[PDB]
Write a protein that binds this ligand. Structure first.
Ligand SMILES: Nc1ncnc2c1ncn2[C@@H]1O[C@H](COP(=O)(O)OP(=O)(O)OP(O)(O)=S)[C@@H](O)[C@H]1O
Lengths: 380, 82, 239, 248, 109, 228, 370
C-alpha cells in the first residue's frame, strides 16, 4: 500500500498543479489601407479560344463553365490577346483587362533539382567504362560539338540503365548532376500519375514546355515502372489511364520532331516490364547495365568507403574483397558502417581487420539466404 | 447479453471491384469504440492484405477490451498462416 | 538450376540436392562416438519406447566385422541397405585379402558407393551419415564419418543428428588430452556426452563400446544409472 | 511445388510418395494382431460386403504364405498379389537353399528391400501396401510384424493400420494385456476393438474375418476358422455387454 | 426444394408452370442475367429478396439457371477457388438466417 | 532456361561448363610454382575442428614417384580422377617399363574430363594442379573441368586466385630459386588466408630431379614458416 | 484504494486536455478577415499587393492582399485565406496538411520498456544500438565519422513480440513518433499512392528527428516481376513511390524506419537492400532459457501457489511462442477461477498447456526417419 501512497499523493499534487492554472486563469501596414482596396474586383482569369477578324470579339473558356464571348477593355495592348494566352476577364464589363502567364503548374517546376548534390566522379568507382560511355553521352556533345559534325554521326539522346538493386544508378545520376553545368531535372514518375482525366498527359505537356524554353537541359527519369511499360489489358478492364499518359509521353517524346538539345537518362530495376515503344533505338540508344566488380572494383569501393573513416594503417582489402563473393557498394558500405558499430561495441579509436571480418560475417554470412545454415564441408 | 452484438457474416466484397475497399473492421473498430461494450460475429483466409491489416488492428494493440470477435466456421486447415 | 534434379549446378555453383540430403541427417537422432586410447566408445540417444513393442530389431548400432562398428543417422532404410552391402563387401575383402579389414578400406568403399550412387541418373541419395569406428593396425583406434556427398573424414570425436553443434561443442569444451585413456575416463566421457545430450532423459540412453580386442558389449541401464549418479555427485562437488 | 516424381528430395528434406503412400494406407481395410503366447491371431475387415458375391475363396486378406506363416494385408489390392507371389517365392527359394523353414525376420527384410528398391529408383510407383505377419520360428516363438512402404519394419506386439485404427491402438494401449496368453481373452479383446472401430451395427459376422495360428505338437497349424464360433463369440461379447450394463 | 435431373424432363417447365398458376408475389429470377461483377451481388439479390418479399406480400422467388456464384470477372489469387467458394459460403450465410418466417420460397434447378 | 548439358546459348556456350568454372571458386586456395631447380607446391586446409585430424585431409596426393598433385573444389570428383590417374600411369609403366610424362598423364585425364554424357555422367567440378619431373626437367601443369589443359609457370587456383595471380606476377620471373619461391608462395598464402600461419594450416610439396622421392616437407615446414 | 487515484489521474488528464489578442487591433484583424474564411491555392504572386489564386472549383482572381503578419511568408503552393466578398487575401495560414496526419500519430507511450519482453538481448541489443544509441548518445558517429543505420526489418514466426518490440521502442524515446499500418492503400483511386507518402515524410521532416514506423506490409512485396497477363493495378506503383521516397534523392535527414513482417520471402527484394533498409532481425522460437523469463513476467503479479514448477511445462514440450505462454498463464487462471479458488495448482497448468497447444496438427510422420 506504499505504492498506493506514492501514486495517490503524486496524482493529488498533480491535481493541485492543474488547479494552479485553473485559478490563475484570471495596423498601419495592416488596418488603415483595407477599405481602400475593398473596391477592387474578383475578375477571372481565362484562356482564349480564337480571335475574330477586324475586331476582338473574343471567345474564351476559363476552366469549366462555358465558352465565353467577351470584349477587351480600352486600355489593352490589343495585339497580344491572341490564343493560348490566359487573360483577365471582368465580372461586370466582361472585357479583357490584363494578360496573365499560362498554366505554368509550379509543381512541375518543383521536380527540377534546383541544387547540386555532391557525389564526386571519384566516388562511383568500379564501372570506369560504363560511366565512360555515359560520359560520352553527357559531357562530350555538350562541350565539343565537333566530332559529331566532323564525322557525321548522331548523339545518343536517350540512355536506359538497368541492373540489380544496389548497383550505382542513383550514384551515376547524382554524379553527373554534381558536374553538370546544365539545367538538370529529376522526374518522379508519379508526378505524371494524378487523379483526374487527362492530366498526366498535360504533365508531359508541362515537361515539353519547360524543355523547349531553353538549351542543353537535362531530364532525368527514374523508376519508369511507376510510369509503366506494361500494356497489361484483357477482359478485366481496370487500370488503363496511366498507359494513356505514357503513350502521350511517347508521342511528344520521339517520332515526328523529337526533343533536340535534350539528353534523357532513365533507370529501371525491371527491364522485362518495359514497352517496346521505348526499347526502339532512336529513343533509347545505350542500354547500359552495370555489373558486380570482380576484386579491383570491390577493393576500390573499399578505398572510397574507408578513406574517410578511422581504420588501421595495416589492414588490406584483398582478403575482404575475397569474402565478398557477390556484393555491391551498398553492401560494402554496410560492411564499413557495421564494423564501425563493432568498434562502438569495443572502445576503439580506429577499425581493424577483424572488425571488418565480423562485419562481412554480419552482412553476407549473416544475410538471410535461406534456409539457412550451410554447415557442410564437401569443398575444403 | 444486452450488448452491442454485431454480425459481419458477409463476404470479402468491394475491395477494388465497384468501390474503395477497407472492408473487414476498418471503421468498424472505430464504432466498437463508439459503442464500447460490444461483441463481433463472423462466419469467417480468403484475400491477403485486408484481413492482415485488421488483425493488426485487433491484436492486442486495440483499446479497452471486452470487444470480442467470434469467428465460426468448419474445416480449420483452409486458412492462412497468421 | 532448381532443386530438380541432381545433375544441374546452381547459377552460383552449388548442387542443391547434396546440401538438401544432408538436412535429413541434420534432422535425425543423435549418436556420438569418441576414441579412447585402448577402448573405443559410441552410443545413440532416443530409444523412444512406445510402451507396446520390442526394440531389439530397431538397433542403430551393428557390426560388419569382428573389429568394426556402425552408427548412422537420417532415415533408417538407407542405413539398412548400406549395412547389407557393407557386410557383403567386408566379407569379399576377407575373401581375397586375408587381413582383418582396415577401417579406411570400408569407409572408402562406403563413400565411393555413395558417390557413384549420387552421380547416376535419378538414383535418390542415401540420406544417412555413418560413424565407422575401429582399431586394427596395432590396435590403433580410428573413427571416420561419412556424408551424403561421400566424404570420409577422420576425426577423434563426433556428434551427428539433431543439434549436433551443441554436442560437439561439449566435446570441444571437454575433450582433454589427459589422461589417457584410461577406460574410466572414456566411460565417464560417454557419461558426460550422454548427460550433454539434447534431452538426457536418463532412460533413453543406449551405448556400446569396444576395447579394440573384444567384441561389442551392450550395457545395462543400471551401470549407466550409477554413472549418472556419480556424474551428479561430481556436479555436486563443483558446489 | 516439389511434387513431380518419387525422387528427388524436398527442400527440408522430406518425402512426397512416402507420406502419400501412408495416406493411401489410411483408406483401406482394418487389421490387427494380438499379444498371445501359445498361439497368435489375426483380425480383418471385409470390404464390399454386398450381397452378390461368392465368398468361395475362404480368404480374401489372409495369405498362408509358407506353412507356418500367414499375412494380413491392407492397401491397393493387386500390388499385394504382386507382393505375395514374390514373398512365397522368396521363402520357398530359402527352403530350397537350406531345407529349413525361413526364420521370418530375414523374410521380412527381404520384402522390405524389395519395397525399398522402388523407393530409391526412378521413376516407379512405390508399393502402397502395408501388411502384417504372423509366424513361428525356432528362435523366438510367435511373432508379429508390420511392414511399411518406406521399407521400415517394426516388430510389434499390438499393431496399427491406418485412419480407422488409431483409436484401435489407443484401445490396445488403454486395454494393454500382459501375461494372459489365452486365445479366447484375446478374441474377446479383438471383438471389443472391432465393435468400437468398425461402424457395423452389432458386428455382423459376415463383415469380419478371423484367422489364428497355433503350435500343435510339431506342425504349427494355421486355423482360418469357420463362422459358427464367430457367431458365438459375438454372442459372448454381447453377453459381456450385458455384464457391462449391470452398472445401470 | 432442390430440383435437378436431365435437362428437359420438366424443371423449367414446372417452375414456369407454378409461375403460371401462382398465388403469392412470384418473382421470376434467372441466376446470372443481371449479375454485375459484384462478387457478392447475390447479397444484393437477397436484399431485394428480403425487403421486397416483405415490401410485397411474401414473395416466391425461383432462381433459374443456377450460375449466380460463378460470374465472369473472377479475379482473385487462385483460379476462383476462394472466389466460387466465397460466394458459395456467402449464399450459405444468407440462407441460414432468413427468419424461418420470411415467406420466400427459394428453388434451384 | 540454359537447363541442360545438351543446349548451347544464343551467344555461345555452356552454362553447364560455366557453372562448373563457377563451382571451382568455392574451394580452398593452392599455389604451385615451376622452378628449373624443381616444382614446389602449397595449399591451405581450412581446418574446422580441433577434432578434425589435419593429416587426414588430402590435398597433395601421390601419383608417381616423381609426379605430385593438388585438388580443388569438389572432393569426390577429385577422388575419382586421382584413382584413374594412378591406374593409368601404372598401365603406362606396365606396357612401357617407363614413366608416363606429366603432359601425357594429363592428356589421359582430360580424355574424360569431358566425356560427360548421361545418354548415348555430369561434368566434373574440380581443378587440378599437376607437378612432375619429366625428361624435360620439372613441369608444372594446370587443367580445368572443361579439359582445356595448359602449361602454367606459376598457377594459383580456387578462392582468391585473382590477387594470388596479381601479386604472383609481381614477384615471379624466370630465374627464381627454390627457397625464394617457397617463401614467395607462403607470403602470398598468409596474405590470402584469414588465420595465422602455423604448423597445421598449410602443407608443402616439393619435387626435385635429384630428390624425386618424397614430394613432401614434414615439420621442417615449421622451420620454414618461422623464417618469415 | 489506488483505483480512485488512477481514475482521478485519467480524469485530470482529460481536464488538462480541456485546458487547451487585441481589444481593437484584433477586431481590425476580424475585419482584415471576412469571417467565412476559405482555402485557396496561389499560382503566382505579382508582389504589388494583389495576387492570383486558385480555388477548389477553379476560379482564379486578382485579389488584394491584407497583411498583418509578413505577407511574404506564404508562397505559391501554400494556401491562403480568401473571403466571400471579394475573396480578399486575409493572411496567416500555418501550413496545414491532410486529416490523415494526426490519424497515424500516436500521442502516448502506453506500454513499457525492455523490461516487458523476456530475453532476446542480442538483437534487442541491436535495435538498442541502432535507435537508442544514435538518438541519446550520438557521440561516436561524429567522433568516428560513421553514419548510423536506418532500416530495421522484424520477421520470423509470428507472436514473438514484434508488436511488443514495437511498443517497447515506442516507450523509450524523446524523438517524435508515428504509427503507420502501411497496407492502408486499398482504394479505387488512381494516383493517391504518393499523396499519403509525400505528406507523411514532409510532416516527419518538419517536426523533429523521428521514427516513421511501417507495420506489416509483407503481403505488398509483390514479387517484382509483373502481374501475369493483364494485371497492373496500382500497388506496384505505390510501393515504387515509397521506394523512391526512401532511397532516391532529397537527403534522408534524421528519419528512422522500423519494419515488421511475419513471412519474409514473399517480400520485394528491391527494398531489402542495405542502405534502403539496413538491419534484419530474426525472431525465432526462442529457447528453454528465456521461456523461464516469459513465465516469470507472466507470473509477476498473479496468485500462484509456488509449489508448482513452470519448468516442468518447459521440460514437457519445447517449441511455442511467448504469446502461448501468456495464453496459458491466463487460461490456467480461469481454470482456477472455475470454483472461487485462491491460487493455481499444477493441473490447471496442465489442462491449459494442452488447451492452448491445439495449434500444430500434421501429419502423419516424421516421426519416421527414425
Ligand atoms: N561504386 C560504388 N561506390 C559507392 N557506393 C556505391 C557504389 N555502387 C553502388 N553503391 C551504392 O548504391 C547506391 C546507388 O545505387 P542504388 O541506390 O541502388 O540506385 P537505386 O535507385 O537504388 O536502384 P534501384 O534498383 O531502383 S533500388 C549508392 O547510394 C550506394 O549506397
Amino acid at each position: 500500500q506504499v505504492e498506493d501512497d506514492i501514486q495517490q499523493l503524486l496524482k493529488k499534487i498533480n491535481e493541485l498543479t492543474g488547479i494552479k492554472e485553473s485559478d490563475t486563469g484570471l495596423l498601419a501596414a495592416d488596418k488603415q489601407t483595407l477599405q481602400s482596396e475593398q473596391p477592387l474586383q474578383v475578375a477571372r482569369c481565362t484562356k482564349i479560344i480564337n480571335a475574330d477578324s477586324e475586331d476582338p470579339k473574343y471567345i474564351i473558356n476559363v476552366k469549366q463553365f462555358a465558352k465565353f464571348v467577351v470584349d477587351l477593355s480600352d486600355q489593352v495592348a490589343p495585339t497580344d490577346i491572341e490564343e493560348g494566352m490566359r487573360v483577365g476577364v471582368d465580372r461586370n464589363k466582361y472585357q479583357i483587362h490584363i494578360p496573365l502567364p499560362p498554366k505554368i503548374d509550379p509543381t512541375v517546376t518543383m521536380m527540377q533539382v534546383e541544387e547540386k548534390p555532391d557525389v564526386t566522379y571519384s566516388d562511383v568507382g568500379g564501372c570506369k567504362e560504363q560511366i565512360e560511355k555515359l560520359r560520352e553521352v553527357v559531357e562530350t556533345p555538350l562541350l565539343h560539338p565537333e566530332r559529331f559534325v566532323n564525322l557525321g554521326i548522331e548523339p545518343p539522346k536517350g540512355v536506359l540503365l538497368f541492373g540489380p538493386p544496389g548497383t550505382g544508378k542513383t550514384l551515376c545520376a547524382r554524379a553527373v548532376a554534381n558536374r553538370t553545368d546544365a539545367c538538370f531535372i529529376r522526374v518522379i514518375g508519379s508526378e505524371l500519375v494524378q487523379k483526374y482525366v487527362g492530366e498526366g498527359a498535360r504533365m508531359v505537356r508541362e515537361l515539353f514546355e519547360m524543355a523547349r524554353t531553353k538549351k542543353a537541359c537535362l531530364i532525368f527519369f527514374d523508376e519508369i515502372d511507376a510510369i509503366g511499360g506494361a500494356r497489361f489489358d484483357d477482359g478485366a478492364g481496370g487500370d488503363n489511364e496511366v498507359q494513356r499518359t505514357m503513350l502521350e509521353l511517347i508521342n511528344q517524346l520521339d517520332g515526328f520532331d523529337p526533343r533536340g538539345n535534350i539528353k534523357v537518362l532513365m533507370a529501371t530495376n525491371r527491364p522485362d516490364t518495359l514497352d517496346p515503344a521505348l526499347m526502339r533505338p532512336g529513343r533509347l540508344d545505350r542500354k547500359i547495365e552495370f555489373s558486380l566488380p570482380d576484386l579491383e572494383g570491390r577493393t576500390h569501393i573499399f578505398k572510397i568507403h574507408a578513406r574517410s573513416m578511422s581504420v588501421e594503417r595495416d589492414i588490406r582489402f584483398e582478403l575482404l574483397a575475397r569474402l565478398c563473393p557477390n556484393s555491391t557498394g551498398a553492401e560494402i558500405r554496410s560492411v564499413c558502417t557495421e564494423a564501425g558499430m563493432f568498434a562502438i561495441r569495443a572502445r576503439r579509436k580506429i577499425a581493424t581487420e577483424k572488425d571488418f571480418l565480423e562485419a562481412v560475417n554480419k552482412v553476407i554470412k549473416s544475410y538471410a539466404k535461406f534456409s539457412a545454415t550451410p554447415r557442410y564441408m564437401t569443398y575444403n | 447479453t444486452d450488448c452491442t452484438f454485431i454480425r459481419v457474416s458477409g463476404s470479402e466484397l468491394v475491395q477494388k471491384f465497384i468501390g474503395e475497399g477497407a472492408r473487414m473492421v476498418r471503421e468498424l473498430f472505430v464504432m466498437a469504440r463508439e459503442h464500447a461494450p460490444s461483441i463481433i460475429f463472423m462466419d469467417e483466409s480468403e484475400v491477403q492484405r485486408t484481413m492482415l491489416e485488421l488483425l493488426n488492428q485487433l491484436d492486442g494493440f486495440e483499446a479497452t477490451k471486452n470487444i470480442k470477435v467470434i469467428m465460426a466456421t468448419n474445416r480449420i486447415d483452409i486458412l492462412d498462416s497468421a | 538450376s532448381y532443386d530438380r534434379a541432381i545433375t544441374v549446378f546452381s547459377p552460383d555453383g552449388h548442387l542443391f540436392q547434396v546440401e538438401y540430403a544432408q538436412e535429413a541427417v541434420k534432422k535425425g537422432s543423435t549418436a556420438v562416438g569418441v576414441r579412447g586410447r585402448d577402448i573405443v566408445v559410441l552410443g545413440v540417444e532416443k530409444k523412444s519406447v512406445a510402451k507396446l513393442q520390442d526394440e531389439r530389431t530397431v538397433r542403430k548400432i551393428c557390426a560388419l566385422d569382428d573389429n568394426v562398428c556402425m552408427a548412422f543417422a537420417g532415415l533408417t532404410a538407407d542405413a539398412r541397405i548400406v549395412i547389407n552391402r557393407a557386410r557383403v563387401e567386408c566379407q569379399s575383402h576377407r575373401l581375397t585379402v586375408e587381413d582383418p579389414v582396415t577401417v579406411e578400406y570400408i569407409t572408402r568403399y562406403i563413400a565411393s558407393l555413395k558417390q557413384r550412387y549420387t552421380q547416376s541418373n535419378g538414383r535418390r541419395p542415401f540420406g544417412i551419415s555413418a560413424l565407422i569406428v575401429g582399431f586394427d593396425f596395432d590396435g590403433t583406434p580410428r573413427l571416420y564419418q561419412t556424408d551424403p556427398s561421400g566424404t570420409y573424414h577422420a576425426w577423434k570425436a563426433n556428434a551427428i543428428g539433431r543439434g549436433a553443434k551443441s554436442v560437439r561443442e561439449f566435446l570441444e569444451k571437454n575433450y582433454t588430452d589427459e589422461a589417457i585413456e584410461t577406460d574410466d575416463l572414456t566411460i565417464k566421457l560417454v557419461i558426460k556426452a550422454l548427460l550433454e545430450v539434447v534431452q538426457s532423459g536418463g532412460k533413453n540412453i543406449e551405448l556400446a563400446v569396444m576395447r579394440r580386442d573384444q567384441s561389442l558389449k551392450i550395457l545395462n541401464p543400471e551401470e549407466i544409472e550409477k554413472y549418472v549418479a556419480e556424474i551428479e555427485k561430481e556436479k555436486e562437488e563443483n558446489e | 511445388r516439389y511434387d513431380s516424381r518419387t525422387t528427388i528430395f524436398s527442400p527440408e528434406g522430406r518425402l512426397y510418395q512416402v507420406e502419400y503412400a501412408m495416406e493411401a494406407i489410411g483408406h483401406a481395410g482394418t487389421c490387427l494382431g494380438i499379444l498371445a503366447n501359445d498361439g497368435v491371431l489375426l483380425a480383418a475387415e471385409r470390404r464390399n460386403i454386398h450381397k452378390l458375391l461368392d465368398e468361395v475363396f475362404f480368404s480374401e486378406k489372409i495369405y498362408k504364405l509358407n506353412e507356418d506363416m500367414a499375412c494380413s494385408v491392407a492397401g491397393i489390392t493387386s500390388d499385394a498379389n504382386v507382393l505375395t507371389n514374390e514373398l512365397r517365392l522368396i521363402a520357398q527359394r530359402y527352403l530350397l537353399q537350406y531345407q529349413e523353414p525361413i526364420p521370418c525376420e530375414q523374410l521380412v527384410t527381404a520384402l522390405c528391400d524389395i519395397k525399398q528398391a522402388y523407393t530409391q529408383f526412378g521413376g516407379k510407383r512405390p508399393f502402397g501396401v502395408s501388411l502384417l505377419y504372423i509366424g513361428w520360428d525356432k528362435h523366438y516363438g510367435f511373432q508379429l510384424y508390420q511392414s511399411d512402404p518406406s521399407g521400415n519394419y517394426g516388430g510389434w506386439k499390438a499393431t496399427c493400420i491406418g485412419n480407422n485404427s488409431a483409436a484401435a491402438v489407443s484401445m490396445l494401449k488403454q486395454d494393454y494385456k500382459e501375461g494372459e496368453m489365452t486365445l479366447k481373452s484375446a478374441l474377446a479383446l479383438a471383438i471389443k476393438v472391432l465393435n468400437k472401430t468398425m461402424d457395423v451395427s452389432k458386428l455382423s459376422a459376415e463383415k469380419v474375418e478371423i484367422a489364428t495360428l497355433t503350435r500343435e505338437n510339431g506342425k504349427t497349424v494355421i486355423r482360418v476358422l469357420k463362422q459358427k464360433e464367430v457367431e458365438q463369440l459375438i454372442k459372448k461379447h454381447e453377453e459381456e455387454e450385458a455384464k457391462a450394463e449391470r452398472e445401470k | 426444394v432442390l430440383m435437378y435431373g436431365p435437362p428437359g424432363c420438366g424443371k423449367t417447365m414446372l417452375a414456369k408452370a407454378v409461375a403460371h398458376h401462382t398465388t403469392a408475389a412470384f418473382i421470376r429470377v434467372v441466376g446470372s442475367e443481371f449479375v454485375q461483377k459484384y462478387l457478392g451481388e447475390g447479397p444484393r439479390m437477397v436484399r431485394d429478396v428480403f425487403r421486397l418479399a416483405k415490401e410485397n406480400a411474401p414473395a416466391i422467388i425461383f432462381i433459374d439457371e443456377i450460375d449466380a456464384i460463378a460470374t465472369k470477372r473472377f479475379d482473385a489469387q487462385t483460379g476462383a477457388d476462394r472466389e466460387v467458394q466465397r460466394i458459395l459460403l456467402e449464399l450459405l450465410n444468407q440462407m441460414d438466417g432468413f427468419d424461418q418466417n420470411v415467406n420466400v420460397k427459394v428453388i434451384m434447378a | 532456361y540454359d537447363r541442360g548439358v545438351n543446349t548451347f546459348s544464343p551467344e555461345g556456350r555452356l552454362f553447364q561448363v560455366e557453372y562448373a568454372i563457377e563451382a571451382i571458386k568455392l574451394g580452398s586456395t593452392a599455389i604451385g610454382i615451376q622452378t628449373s631447380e624443381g616444382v614446389c607446391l602449397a595449399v591451405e586446409k581450412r581446418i574446422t575442428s580441433p577434432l578434425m585430424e589435419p593429416s587426414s585431409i588430402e590435398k597433395i596426393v601421390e601419383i608417381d614417384a616423381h609426379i605430385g598433385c593438388a585438388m580443388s573444389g569438389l572432393i569426390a570428383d577429385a577422388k575419382t580422377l586421382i584413382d584413374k590417374a594412378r591406374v593409368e600411369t601404372q598401365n603406362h609403366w606396365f606396357t612401357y617399363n617407363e614413366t608416363m610424362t606429366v603432359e601425357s598423364v594429363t592428356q589421359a585425364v582430360s580424355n574424360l574430363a569431358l566425356q560427360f554424357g548421361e545418354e548415348d555422367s555430369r561434368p566434373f567440378g574440380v581443378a587440378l594442379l599437376f607437378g612432375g619431373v619429366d625428361e624435360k626437367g620439372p613441369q608444372l601443369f594446370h587443367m580445368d573441368p572443361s579439359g582445356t589443359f595448359v602449361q602454367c609457370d606459376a598457377r594459383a587456383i580456387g578462392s582468391a586466385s585473382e590477387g594470388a595471380q596479381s601479386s604472383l606476377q609481381e614477384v615471379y620471373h624466370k630465374s627464381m630459386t627454390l627457397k625464394e619461391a617457397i617463401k614467395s608462395s607462403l607470403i602470398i598464402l598468409k596474405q590470402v588466408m584469414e588465420e595465422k600461419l602455423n604448423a597445421t594450416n598449410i602443407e608443402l610439396a616439393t619435387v626435385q630431379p635429384g630428390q624425386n622421392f618424397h614430394m613432401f616437407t614434414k615439420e621442417e615446414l615449421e622451420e620454414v614458416i618461422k623464417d618469415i | 484504494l489506488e483505483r480512485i487515484k488512477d481514475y482521478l489521474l485519467m480524469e485530470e488528464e482529460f481536464i488538462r486536455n480541456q485546458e487547451q489578442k487585441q481589444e481593437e487591433e484584433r477586431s481590425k484583424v476580424d475585419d482584415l478577415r471576412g469571417t467565412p474564411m476559405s482555402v485557396g491555392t496561389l499560382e503566382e504572386i505579382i508582389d504589388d499587393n494583389h495576387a492570383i489564386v486558385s480555388t477548389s472549383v477553379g476560379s482564379e482572381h486578382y485579389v488584394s492582399i491584407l497583411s498583418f503578419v509578413d505577407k511574404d511568408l506564404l508562397e505559391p503552393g501554400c494556401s491562403v485565406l480568401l473571403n466571400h466578398k471579394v475573396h480578399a487575401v486575409i493572411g496567416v495560414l500555418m501550413d496545414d496538411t491532410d486529416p490523415l496526419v494526426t490519424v497515424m500519430k500516436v500521442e502516448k507511450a502506453p506500454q513499457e520498456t525492455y523490461a516487458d519482453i523476456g530475453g532476446l538481448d542480442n538483437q534487442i541489443q541491436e535495435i538498442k544500438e541502432s535507435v537508442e544509441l544514435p538518438l541519446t548518445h550520438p557521440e561516436y558517429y561524429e567522433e568516428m565519422g560513421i553514419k548510423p543505420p536506418k532500416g530495421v526489418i522484424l520477421y520470423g514466426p509470428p507472436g514473438t513480440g514484434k508488436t511488443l518490440l514495437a511498443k517497447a521502442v515506442a516507450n523509450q524515446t524523446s524523438a517524435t513518433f508515428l504509427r503507420v499500418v502501411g497496407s492502408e492503400l486499398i482504394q479505387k483511386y488512381l494516383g493517391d499512392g504518393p499523396k499519403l507518402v509525400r505528406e507523411l515524410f514532409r510532416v516527419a521532416e518538419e517536426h523533429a528527428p523521428s521514427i516513421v514506423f511501417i507495420d506489416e506490409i509483407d503481403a505488398i512485396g509483390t514479387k517484382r516481376y509483373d502481374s501475369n497477363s493483364g494485371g497492373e493495378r496500382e500497388i506496384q506503383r505505390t510501393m515504387l513511390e515509397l521506394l523512391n521516397q526512401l532511397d532516391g534523392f532529397d537527403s534522408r535527414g534524421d528519419v528512422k524506419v522500423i519494419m515488421a513482417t511475419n513471412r519474409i520471402e514473399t517480400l520485394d527484394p528491391a527494398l531489402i537492400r542495405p542502405g534502403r533498409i539496413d538491419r534484419k532481425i530474426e525472431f525465432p522460437l526462442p529457447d528453454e532459457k528465456t521461456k523461464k523469463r516469459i513465465f516469470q513476467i507472466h507470473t509477476s503479479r498473479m496468485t500462484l501457489a509456488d509449489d508448482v514448477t513452470l519448468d516442468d511445462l518447459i521440460m514437457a514440450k519445447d517449441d511455442l511462442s511467448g504469446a502461448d505462454i501468456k495464453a496459458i498463464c491466463t487460461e490456467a487462471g480461469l481454470m482456477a477461477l472455475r470454483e472461487r479458488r485462491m491460487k493455481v495448482t499444477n493441473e490447471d497448468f496442465k489442462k491449459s498447456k494442452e488447451n492452448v497447444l491445439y495449434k500444430k496438427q500434421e501429419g502423419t510422420p516424421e516421426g519416421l526417419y527414425l
